[PDB]
Amino acid sequence: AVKYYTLEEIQKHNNSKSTWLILHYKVYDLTKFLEEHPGGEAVLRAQAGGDATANFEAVGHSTDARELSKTFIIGELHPDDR
């Protein structure tokens, strides 16, 4: 089933040991992706622990990038925090 994470819990994952971010209500664990991301590690680290949906869409990722992003989904933002 779907696992929910509250905004409070997501905010704790804003470091090198654990980098999580929110995109369109979905939670992504990008910890192991930081060094492979074509756009660099900095833009990810800076948005860690929060909603980066706007910044993500503002750069205009390709279909391949979006398809790949799905493999990093670990749950969704708790409904009451949306």
Residues that bind ligand HEM (CB under 6 A): 21, 23, 28, 30, 37-39, 43-44, 47, 52, 55-56, 59, 61-62, 64-65, 68-69
38, 64 in Cβ contact below 8 A?
no
Nearer to ligand HEM, 63 or 80 (CB): 63
Nearer to ligand HEM, 38 or 79 (CB): 38
Ranked by CB distance to ligand HEM, the top (closest) residue is: 39
Tokens at 67, concatenated: 């398809």
Task: Work out the number of other CB atoms within 10 angstroms of the CB of residue 66.
Answer: 11
What is d(CA 69, CA 72) in angstroms, rounded to the nearest whole number?
6
